[PDB]
Structure formats: C-alpha cells, structure tokens
Design a protein around this ligand. Structure first.
Ligand SMILES: CN1[C@@H](CC(=O)c2ccccc2)CCC[C@H]1C[C@H](O)c1ccccc1
Ligand SMILES: CN1[C@@H](CC(=O)c2ccccc2)CCC[C@H]1C[C@H](O)c1ccccc1
Ligand SMILES: CN1[C@@H](CC(=O)c2ccccc2)CCC[C@H]1C[C@H](O)c1ccccc1
Ligand SMILES: CN1[C@@H](CC(=O)c2ccccc2)CCC[C@H]1C[C@H](O)c1ccccc1
Ligand SMILES: CN1[C@@H](CC(=O)c2ccccc2)CCC[C@H]1C[C@H](O)c1ccccc1
Ligand SMILES: CN1C[C@](C)(O)C(=O)C=C1c1ccc(Br)cc1
Ligand SMILES: CN1C[C@](C)(O)C(=O)C=C1c1ccc(Br)cc1
Ligand SMILES: CN1C[C@](C)(O)C(=O)C=C1c1ccc(Br)cc1
Ligand SMILES: CN1C[C@](C)(O)C(=O)C=C1c1ccc(Br)cc1
Ligand SMILES: CN1C[C@](C)(O)C(=O)C=C1c1ccc(Br)cc1
Ligand SMILES: CN1C[C@](C)(O)C(=O)C=C1c1ccc(Br)cc1
Ligand SMILES: CN1C[C@](C)(O)C(=O)C=C1c1ccc(Br)cc1
Ligand SMILES: CN1C[C@](C)(O)C(=O)C=C1c1ccc(Br)cc1
Ligand SMILES: CN1C[C@](C)(O)C(=O)C=C1c1ccc(Br)cc1
Ligand SMILES: CN1C[C@](C)(O)C(=O)C=C1c1ccc(Br)cc1
Ligand SMILES: CC(=O)N[C@@H]1[C@@H](O)[C@H](O)[C@@H](CO)O[C@H]1O
Ligand SMILES: CC(=O)N[C@@H]1[C@@H](O)[C@H](O)[C@@H](CO)O[C@H]1O
Ligand SMILES: CC(=O)N[C@@H]1[C@@H](O)[C@H](O)[C@@H](CO)O[C@H]1O
Ligand SMILES: CC(=O)N[C@@H]1[C@@H](O)[C@H](O)[C@@H](CO)O[C@H]1O
Ligand SMILES: CC(=O)N[C@@H]1[C@@H](O)[C@H](O)[C@@H](CO)O[C@H]1O
Ligand SMILES: CC(=O)N[C@@H]1[C@@H](O)[C@H](O)[C@@H](CO)O[C@H]1O
Ligand SMILES: CC(=O)N[C@@H]1[C@@H](O)[C@H](O)[C@@H](CO)O[C@H]1O
Ligand SMILES: CC(=O)N[C@@H]1[C@@H](O)[C@H](O)[C@@H](CO)O[C@H]1O
Ligand SMILES: CC(=O)N[C@@H]1[C@@H](O)[C@H](O)[C@@H](CO)O[C@H]1O
Ligand SMILES: CC(=O)N[C@@H]1[C@@H](O)[C@H](O)[C@@H](CO)O[C@H]1O
Lengths: 205, 205, 205, 205, 204
C-alpha cells in the first residue's frame, strides 16, 4: 500500500534499533519459547549435540506503535530484524554460531508488538554419554540476555511444544522441561533471568 | 542504453524493497515452481537429503512498471534482487541455509512483471530409510512465505520440471508430484498458502 | 596520479554498475575464455568434479571511456568490480558457489575496454565414473549470462590455454575443447548463448 | 529512553571508533582475562587444540564518559562494539579466526568504562603430543595488541577462572597459569606487552 | 584530541581505490613471508596448508601529514579498508586467504604504511617427496594482480624462519625467496612477483 512506504520511511529516520525500549520503572518483557524440530546428531567424543529448533520471541516496543488513522489499511508489517531493536538473547552453552534457516523478518503490529519466529540450527556442549541407554542423555539448552538484567529485560517463557518434532528421527524424546530461573552473578547486584530447555533423549532400538 | 540509465535512477529515490507491492487490497500473486537437478546425497543416519534445484518465481510489482513510450528501446532490465521486493519464501523443512549458486539478479519488464530463477543447493529433513528399496524414499520439499498470508501474497504453482534432471546420478528419479495447499493456522485469522514438491527416488542397482 | 582521483570521482557521480552498456541495438560483446589450472578432486559417489580455473573476460563499456586530454597521464586504471558493470556469467552446472581466489578488480582503459581475470575454485556436476579408465572422464564446464540474451550480451570465445595446467596432478589431461552455442529455454523467447569447455581426463599409473 | 536516544545519537555524531582513546601522555589500560570453558578437540597429527573460552576485557575510554545531569536516568547502556573503539587484541599462535559465539555488545557506563565479555571458539597451534601421558599436554594461548605498543595500550591481566570448565569432557585440567610479559621486537623501538594463558591438560582414564 | 581530525581528513580527501603513484614513478612495496607452520599436506590432491606472516610496506604520499599541525602524533593504526593497499594475489593458492589478525596498518607522518597480516592459506604443491630425505618443495608465489612494475614496483625483504614452530611433524630442509619479473604475451608492460620456496620433510 501507499501508506506502507510512508510507514517504513519513518522507520529509517525516526527510530534507533540500538535502544532498548524500556519505559521508566518498567523493563521490556520478552516472551520466549523453543520448539525442538530435530536432533541432527551427537558427538560422544567431543560432547556436543546438534539441534534444529524453532524459537518464538515476542515483545512490545512502544517506539514501534503507529496511528491506524494515519496509515489506514496497515495493521501489521513484515520488517527486517536489522531495522528493529531485538533482545540480545544468547545461548549460554552453545559452541557454534547459530545458523538461521528462515527469512530474518519479524512481524510488527500498530501497538508496536513484535514477533520474531526463526528456525535455527546450532550445536551445544552436552554430556551425551547416556544416549544409548533407556534413561537417555539429558541436554540443557540455556538462554538469556547477554547484557540486560531483569529490571531492563524481563525474560518470560511461553509454553513449548514437541508437536513439531520429526517422527522418523533416530532419536526419541524421553522427556522435556522448560523453566525460567533468575540468578545473581558476582559483579552486579541485579539478577539475570534465564530460560532453560531440558531435553532427555535416546537412540531408537 | 542512455534512456535505460534514467530508468534505474527512479529505483533508488522512490522504491523500498522492504515493502510488499500489494495494490488496493489485492494480493501479490507469485507463481512458483521447482526443477530438480541432482540429489547430491542422502544421510541415512541423520535423515537428510541434499538437493540442487532451480526455483522459478514470478510476480507483478506495480511499482516497477514504466511508460515504454517514455523510455525508447528498453523492453526489460536486469536488477539486483537486493534492490527489489522479493517473496520471503522459505523451505519449511530445510535443515541448512540455501546456497544460491547463480547471480542474484531478476528480470523486470515494463509491465512490472518480475522473473527470478535461482539455482539452489539445500539440505532437507527427510525419511530416507527406504532409499535402497524398490519403493524407495519419498521426500517432501515444502515452501511458503514466512511472514505473509494469502490476502497479501497469493502463492500459486506452475508445472514442475524434471527434464533437467541429471541422468548419471546414483539415484533414480521414480516420480515427482507438486501440490498447493491454502491452510489456516491456530495463530492467525488468515490462511498461509504452501507449495509442496514430493520427490520419490531410489538407489540405482 | 592527481587525475585518477578526478577520474574515480566521475565514476561515482554518473555511472551505474547495474546498467548493461549496450548501444543502438548493439549488444555488448564479451570475449570469454577458461584456463584449467588444476583438477582438485573427484567424487565418484556423488558425481562431482572440483576445479581451479582462470577466467578471462573482456568487453568494451562505452560509458567508461575518457579523453586522454582531460586526464593527461592516465592510460588505464584498476577498479573494484563493484563499481563496474560486469557480465553476469553463471556456471550452469555448478553445484557449489564460486570461490574467487584473486582480488576483485578489473582493468579499464581510456577507450572503455575492460578486462576482468579472476582465478576461481568451484565444484561441478559431472559423470566422473570413467576416470580410472583409458577413455577417462569427460566434464563439461558450461558458462553463460544468467539474465541477458544474445541481443543484449554477445558472448564470444577466444583461444584456450592448457599451458597453465599443473603437471604434478594425479590427473592426466587428455583433451580440452571449447565451443559457443546458442540455445532456447522455457522462460524466454530469445536465445541465450553459452560457452562450454569440455575436459577429458584420467588417472595416471 | 528519551535520554538513551540522545546518548546513542551523540555516539554516532561525536565519536570515532577508529581512534584509540589515549590521553595526553597516558595510555589506555586494558584489563584482560581468559576463562576456559571446554577443550573441544586436539589434533595430534597437525598439532592443534580447539578451545571454547570466555574473554573478559575492560578499559576506560575517556571519550565515552557522559554527564549524568544531561542523561538523568541513564547509568549504563549496551552498545554494539562496531560503534566503539575496541582493543585490537590478537591471538598470536592462533591458526583459525575467532568464532564469536555471543552477542557483540559491550556495557558502557557514564565514566566511560567499557566491558566486553565475548564467548569464543578458536583453534591454536600447540604441542599436544603429551596429551595421553600423565604429565599432559601444555598449551600456551598468547594474546597481545597487534599494532599498539605499551605506551599507547597498556595490557594488564585479571584473576583467572576455571570454575566454568565443563566437568564432562574427555580432558581433565592439570595446571592453568596466566602471566604478563613485556617483550621487545627488532623492528620497533617500543616494547609490546602480552598476556599468556598456559593450560596443561590430559586425557581422562 | 588530534588523531580525531587526522581520520576526518582521511574521509573527505582520500580515495583508497587510487594507487599512490607520482609523476611517472611507481609505488615501491616491500614484501616478505615468514613461515610459521605447515599445518598439513594432501598427498592425493597435491596441496599444502600453511600459516604465515606477511610483511608489507610502502609509501603513500597522500598519507603524509605536517607534523606541526598534529603535535604528539607519531603513527596511527588505521583500518586497511580506509587505505590503498597493494592488490597482491597468491598465484597458486587454491583457497581464499584466511586472515588471522586485526586488519589494521600503521601509517606515520611520512606516509609510510606497514601492514603485517598473519594468514592461513592452502596452495597447489607437489608434495609427493615429503616422506623422502630430499623432501617436498613448494613454491609460494605472490604478485600484484592488476598493476605492472612501472606502477607497482614489488621488491623483496629477507624472509624469516625463526618464527617456525619447532614441534610439527615437518622439519625444514631449505628456504629461499626471489624477486622475478616477466612480460606476458597479453600486456605491454612487464609484471613482477616474489616467490617464497620451502623444502620440508616428515620427521622420525
Ligand atoms: C554475561 N554473564 C554476565 C556477565 C556479567 O554480569 C559480568 C561478569 C563478570 C564481570 C563483569 C560482569 C551477565 C549475564 C549473562 C552471564 C553469562 C555468563 O557470565 C557466562 C559466561 C561464560 C560462559 C557462559 C555464561
Ligand atoms: C536461467 N535461464 C534463463 C532464465 C532467465 O531469463 C532469467 C534468469 C534469471 C532471473 C530471471 C530470469 C536465462 C539463461 C539461463 C537459463 C537457464 C535455463 O532457463 C534453465 C533453467 C532451469 C532448467 C533448465 C534450463
Ligand atoms: C511461520 N509459520 C506461520 C505461522 C506464524 O507465523 C505463527 C505461528 C505461531 C505463532 C505466531 C505466528 C506463518 C507462515 C509460515 C509458517 C511456518 C510454520 O509455522 C513452521 C514453524 C516451524 C518450522 C517449520 C514451519
Ligand atoms: C606484530 N608484532 C609486533 C611488531 C610489529 O607490529 C611490526 C613488526 C615489523 C615491522 C612493522 C611492525 C607488534 C605486536 C605483535 C607482534 C607479533 C609478532 O611479530 C608475530 C608475528 C607473526 C606471528 C605471530 C607473532
Ligand atoms: C593476471 N596475470 C596478468 C593478467 C593480465 O594482465 C592480462 C591477461 C590477459 C589479458 C589482459 C591482461 C597480470 C599479472 C599477473 C598474471 C597472473 C597469471 O596470468 C596467472 C593466471 C592464472 C593463475 C595464476 C597466474
Ligand atoms: C517509529 N515510527 C515513528 C512515527 C513518527 O510514529 C510514525 O509515524 C511511524 C513509526 C513506525 C514505523 C514503522 C514501524 Br514497523 C513502526 C512504527
Ligand atoms: C551452562 N552454562 C551456564 C552457566 C552455568 O550459567 C555458566 O555460567 C556457564 C555455562 C556454560 C558451560 C559450558 C559451556 Br561450553 C558454555 C557455557
Ligand atoms: C518507480 N518508477 C517511477 C516512475 C516515475 O513512474 C518512472 O517513470 C519509472 C519507475 C521505475 C524505475 C525502475 C524500474 Br526497474 C521500474 C520503474
Ligand atoms: C514439513 N514441515 C512443514 C509443516 C508441516 O508446515 C510444519 O508445520 C513443520 C515442518 C518441518 C518439518 C521438519 C523440520 Br526439521 C522443520 C519443519
Ligand atoms: C563517468 N565518466 C564520464 C565522464 C563524464 O566522461 C568523465 O568525466 C569520466 C568518466 C569516467 C570515470 C571513471 C572511469 Br574508470 C572512466 C570514465
Ligand atoms: C548442464 N546444465 C546446462 C543446461 C543444460 O543448460 C541447463 O539449463 C542446466 C544444467 C544443469 C544440470 C544439472 C545441474 Br545439478 C545443474 C545444471
Ligand atoms: C561521545 N559522547 C559525546 C558527548 C557530547 O559528550 C555526550 O553527550 C555523550 C557521548 C557518549 C555517547 C554515548 C556513549 Br555509550 C558514551 C558517551
Ligand atoms: C606465540 N608466538 C609469539 C612469539 C613467541 O612472539 C613469536 O615470535 C611467534 C609466535 C607464533 C607461534 C605460532 C604461530 Br602458528 C604463530 C606465531
Ligand atoms: C588526506 N590527508 C591530507 C591532508 C588533507 O593534507 C591532511 O591534512 C592530512 C591527511 C591525512 C589523513 C589521515 C592520514 Br592516516 C594521513 C594523512
Ligand atoms: C604459480 N602460477 C603462476 C604462473 C607460473 O605464472 C602461471 O602461469 C600459473 C600458476 C598457477 C599454477 C597452479 C595453479 Br592451481 C594456479 C596458478
Ligand atoms: C502480549 C500482549 O501485550 N498482548 C496483550 C494481551 O494480553 C491483551 O489481552 C490483548 C488485548 O488488549 O492484546 C495485548
Ligand atoms: C492493534 C493490535 O492488534 N494490537 C495488538 C493486540 O491486540 C495483541 O494482543 C498484541 C499481541 O498479540 O499485539 C498488539
Ligand atoms: C501473468 C500476466 O499478468 N501476464 C500474462 C502473460 O502470461 C502473457 O504473456 C501476457 C500476454 O500479453 O499477458 C498475460
Ligand atoms: C510490456 C510487455 O513487455 N508485456 C509483457 C506482459 O504482457 C506480460 O504479461 C509480462 C509477463 O510475461 O511481461 C511483459
Ligand atoms: C577488441 C578491440 O577493440 N581491440 C582491437 C585490437 O584488435 C587491436 O589490435 C587494437 C588496435 O588499437 O585495438 C582494437
Ligand atoms: C586506444 C586503446 O586503448 N585501445 C585498446 C586496444 O589497445 C586494445 O584492443 C584493448 C586493450 O586495451 O582495448 C582497446
Ligand atoms: C559512574 C560509575 O558507575 N563508574 C564506574 C565505577 O564506579 C567502577 O569502578 C567501574 C568498574 O565497574 O566502572 C565505572
Ligand atoms: C579503575 C576503574 O576505572 N574502576 C575502579 C574499579 O575497578 C574499582 O573496583 C573501584 C575502586 O575500588 O572503582 C574504580
Ligand atoms: C624505505 C623507506 O621508505 N624508509 C627509509 C628507511 O629505510 C630508513 O631507515 C630511513 C632513514 O631515515 O629513511 C627512510
Ligand atoms: C617521520 C618519520 O618517522 N618517517 C619515517 C622514516 O624515518 C622511516 O624510515 C619509515 C619506516 O621505515 O617511515 C617513515
């Protein structure tokens, strides 16, 4: 639409993706969930698991709201993430950079609510030695902001799903849990929340 | 051409490649098809198939049409895709990033019709356990827009091609079917169409 | 010299590297040749050949001429290819991205004649099954413009060279031939020329 | 933050990340320490060690201090390192480029103190031949500025931390020391300091 | 605060694509390779994997500065992307160079530039002799890709093998370096190169 150009133009001049959109005495709440799609491989020598997963990330950016009457037909837009502030969520125990599989686009509606749903493949340090047993091997995937504490970035978890897990895999799921925690570090007196996805899996047969 | 040089000039000042060129509540229709070239490898252990294929993609961008009377002998132009809006089609079940092998340019005519034909190598999740049997392995290669629903981006299919299939590969191409679906998801009120290419193949000998 | 700087400044102000420098119905002729340097490897299981080769491309860009008067001591200059229009030659049957080994600069002279001479490593689809036989394996390295038909870009060949081929390779060269063909594709009305280099090689011992 | 937008804007407008924040007769002091997280692998044939570690770098950049009265609510911010001057620290005996695993953001406070804490995977040259003996292999990970001598960049160490060392790898930690040295080089009139992290480890029984 | 204004002048009044020659006089660049480690050899495919240090230096007359105008500035550390740098190609490389160090060069007030990258690269080489007393010999050949000798005068400095790792499986037999120059049938001007040569063999 013609308004669409107008909207994106405003994004270039009148917005900074480096600025965390906190609002006085209020952190930015980001919602986070992980859906495991496939355990690609394990390395029992190097203690690594290779996984493909779908992240669901959402938050409100008050700077990203616009007036519907000003851009009539425009309700939500598809935006390159590079143009937007994005939570600096890090995989604490990853041992490779993430490979993002999908278009690096996010949805933004007129209230400034952003959803970023990337599919990702990444390797993680894990004790995978129990993988050929009945109890399986348990890998914890730990995520959290690298630089923002809880009063600036309130990480919350959404309910996760094993429904997307590939059925014809050589690994079967014995269990999964997802939990939010909040721990202090020696440096700063503010805590840093984390969301941990724990998967227990074993070889079929 | 010199009267071809001004045409490109209009691209920069006016046009935004982030903006899907929907007209007045009419979706952008993209015609989509795949030519299979070579099945490079399968991974029986990790359930992966590695393919090389061309995507034929075409659509009309009404922001990209020009008065042919105003520009003498310019019937069409070759434009870098980074200067153009392109459909954010993703391979839903890919486990690797697409490796684009060809120059990243699209053909645009004065109707604003755009043609983009990349050659791609990509690895997909697939049950390849039957590959050595007479019935062989059947892989679904499923594509759709990552962020746009059918009212915005209407994905339609054209005839798939296999004439370009390599005849000296170790895999015999049994068959290939293509189908379009228009499905609602639990998340949104709008359907998101997909085109799926089903490839049945098996080891020769 | 202190005129190169003015010469380069003119490039930015007026020149568009996406515009193909055609004239009054005249296509840009580009002279093309490939020199085979080394056959790196073969994959007999996946039907792939890995080659390092030197491409020679030359053409005249009528927008890149300058009067030697207004730039006294400037015979020729070395320009980043990103500042120039360059032919979008693709290896039709590659199955990997080209790895350009050398600096990405072309030479341009006062009459707008441009020379671009990259050294490249790339993997191609090829029936290498006869490699250990007397007959050997034959591979076709096929190159052409990805988006410009024969009336826009006239691809012509020049003499081929094997003097540059490594003598200590495990692969013995037998024959190298080149030819120019003009052929039709489903997408398009007009013919697209190609130059194909045919390599026949075999193991020693 | 209304005041954060101002601060980030001022960074772009009135700061050059290419300039080392040395003062009038005074070097920049950078504090540096390496925390070993996991020895991923060793190659006894090529003499390499593959390690994952967490670096702590901090220094004061006097051009990054700000008056709190001009930015009332703002005590510290997370800034992309690309926007900052950062110490050009290189691993002397590295044989691969660093794979930075974490978000490339540093914390800056109002007195210009910067903290950058990347997680890194990187391969180093090392005599790993004693890895299966009781004594173990000893690897030196040596770091220093690549272009700045001690009078412009003063490199100092901090207390080490092996409390993050993965307990379930096939390698056990024997000895781990860290020392600062100030070597001279035949070229330059000026000495160049280095920090060296020495790991002794062996294969578990 | 003075380096600040140096970098500012560099932005408006300098094009890094322009070779800093003068009135009919080439830019001389000095070049030397120091071998650090032979990482591996491929005996089937005829390839050697090496890690080395390149010393490159030259004078860019556009990069000199009045020492009066900037009091306490001896040398500055500058991103190579902001400077003209020689387009030196490895003629017989079979992979892209992997640069291991920060991409910065030193420039002083005379406009002398020093660029010292450390690099991992793979080259075509006959390594069939690597297990013999005489050993394998590999040539590492470097030269400008687009500038003839009357524009870019490549000259060589003495190499260095003191930086060579003592604990690899390869002992060094012999090392040498030489400057060369030839006319190519194609072009009117001659072109120079510097070739570094190693001879090495497995230990034990
Ligand atoms: C980054 N770090 C904290 C950093 C911090 O506050 C700090 C630490 C040390 C000194 C000064 C500040 C903030 C919250 C995330 C946490 C991550 C964890 O450290 C870590 C380090 C290395 C590997 C895995 C995980
Ligand atoms: C790509 N195609 C033509 C298509 C075009 O004009 C084009 C190219 C790129 C972008 C937009 C349009 C141009 C010349 C190369 C040729 C290759 C052949 O079609 C082909 C593709 C797939 C299977 C068999 C044959
Ligand atoms: C992204 N998703 C649709 C739904 C949506 O955006 C969404 C989903 C859930 C919540 C909010 C939005 C949009 C169209 C593509 C589709 C893909 C599929 O989800 C999917 C997820 C994970 C792996 C493979 C495929
Ligand atoms: C680079 N060199 C010093 C000297 C300098 O910059 C230099 C040398 C010679 C000429 C111009 C500048 C600066 C501090 C680091 C030191 C590193 C060591 O050389 C070295 C060389 C090769 C591999 C590993 C280490
Ligand atoms: C690149 N080439 C010359 C090329 C030139 O000026 C030229 C050639 C042909 C036409 C017009 C100009 C310039 C100086 C270096 C020389 C290198 C060697 O060719 C070569 C080719 C392929 C692999 C390794 C080496
Ligand atoms: C950030 N702004 C600025 C302003 C002025 O409020 C406006 O009119 C629209 C936007 C905006 C642009 C793009 C997106 Br996505 C969200 C908000
Ligand atoms: C899993 N974690 C999180 C924790 C415990 O908070 C921490 O500080 C370090 C790691 C960690 C362990 C191993 C590797 Br490899 C990376 C991170
Ligand atoms: C978008 N425009 C604008 C205008 C003014 O209508 C015109 O004359 C031409 C173009 C245009 C520019 C590049 C391409 Br490709 C297509 C159309
Ligand atoms: C094949 N698909 C598409 C579908 C059915 O839409 C879906 O919801 C998820 C996948 C899919 C399968 C495997 C992997 Br790995 C990733 C996505
Ligand atoms: C872009 N032009 C055009 C014009 C106006 O003739 C001129 O002054 C010089 C050039 C030019 C710039 C760079 C190169 Br290389 C060649 C010609
Ligand atoms: C070998 N060719 C050239 C041809 C016939 O022109 C074409 O259009 C496609 C291919 C080709 C075949 C297999 C693979 Br994998 C890639 C390209
Ligand atoms: C670099 N400046 C300039 C100035 C004018 O002093 C100011 O007000 C704030 C900053 C500054 C901006 C961002 C960061 Br982080 C640190 C200091
Ligand atoms: C670790 N160093 C630094 C030192 C000792 O100053 C030197 O001269 C060379 C090296 C070095 C070691 C291995 C490799 Br690979 C590269 C450089
Ligand atoms: C580009 N110049 C020339 C000039 C304008 O005369 C001057 O005053 C200083 C510089 C210059 C800038 C950066 C570096 Br490094 C070297 C010289
Ligand atoms: C090393 N050279 C340079 C030389 C001798 O001038 C030539 O003509 C070809 C090569 C060369 C040899 C092997 C490979 Br692979 C690439 C280039
Ligand atoms: C995450 C978020 O902000 N969503 C809220 C939701 O809780 C609320 O009920 C709804 C209508 O106000 O939309 C908004
Ligand atoms: C204008 C608009 O749709 N506002 C929405 C709200 O209704 C929704 O609940 C929220 C999270 O989905 O995103 C915002
Ligand atoms: C897709 C589209 O909108 N255009 C079609 C095109 O297939 C056809 O070639 C042309 C004939 O004039 O018009 C119609
Ligand atoms: C202006 C022009 O050249 N006409 C055709 C148009 O009819 C066709 O639909 C389109 C897609 O093929 O390409 C163009
Ligand atoms: C392609 C081209 O235009 N080159 C010709 C070339 O054959 C000739 O030898 C030379 C004479 O000036 O230049 C002209
Ligand atoms: C006047 C002039 O430079 N003509 C040249 C000619 O020497 C050659 O045919 C080719 C290579 O430069 O391009 C043109
Ligand atoms: C205003 C302010 O907080 N300044 C701090 C200082 O207190 C602290 O010693 C240093 C290291 O964390 O960082 C800076
Ligand atoms: C040197 C610097 O900038 N910061 C120091 C900080 O590290 C220290 O803990 C404290 C004094 O005790 O504040 C100051
Ligand atoms: C090569 C170069 O440009 N630099 C030289 C340097 O070798 C010499 O030491 C110096 C003596 O002042 O003169 C200058
Ligand atoms: C003013 C100044 O320091 N000029 C130096 C010169 O003395 C030195 O020989 C050369 C590096 O060799 O760099 C330049």
């Amino acid at each position: 639409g013609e308004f669409q150009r107008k909207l994106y133009k405003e994004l270039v001049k009148n917005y900074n993706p480096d600025v965390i959109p906190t609002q006085r005495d209020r952190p930015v709440t980001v919602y986070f969930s992980l859906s495991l799609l496939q355990i690609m491989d394990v390395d029992e020598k190097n203690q690594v698991v290779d996984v493909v997963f779908w992240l669901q990330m959402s938050w409100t950016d008050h700077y990203l709201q616009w007036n519907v009457s000003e851009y009539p037909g425009v309700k939500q837009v598809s935006v390159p993430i590079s143009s937007l502030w994005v939570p600096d969520l890090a995989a604490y125990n990853a041992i490779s950079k993430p490979e993002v599989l999908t278009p690096q686009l996010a949805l933004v509606n007129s209230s400034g609510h952003v959803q970023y749903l990337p599919s990702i493949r990444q390797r993680f340090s894990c004790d995978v030695s129990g993988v050929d047993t009945e109890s399986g091997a348990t890998c914890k995937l730990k995520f959290g902001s690298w630089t923002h504490h809880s009063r600036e970035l309130d990480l919350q978890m959404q309910e996760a799903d094993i429904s997307g897990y590939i059925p014809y895999s050589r690994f079967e799921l014995v269990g999964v849990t997802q939990k939010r925690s909040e721990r202090f570090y020696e440096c700063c007196k503010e805590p840093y929340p984390d969301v941990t996805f724990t998967v227990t899996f074993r070889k079929k047969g």
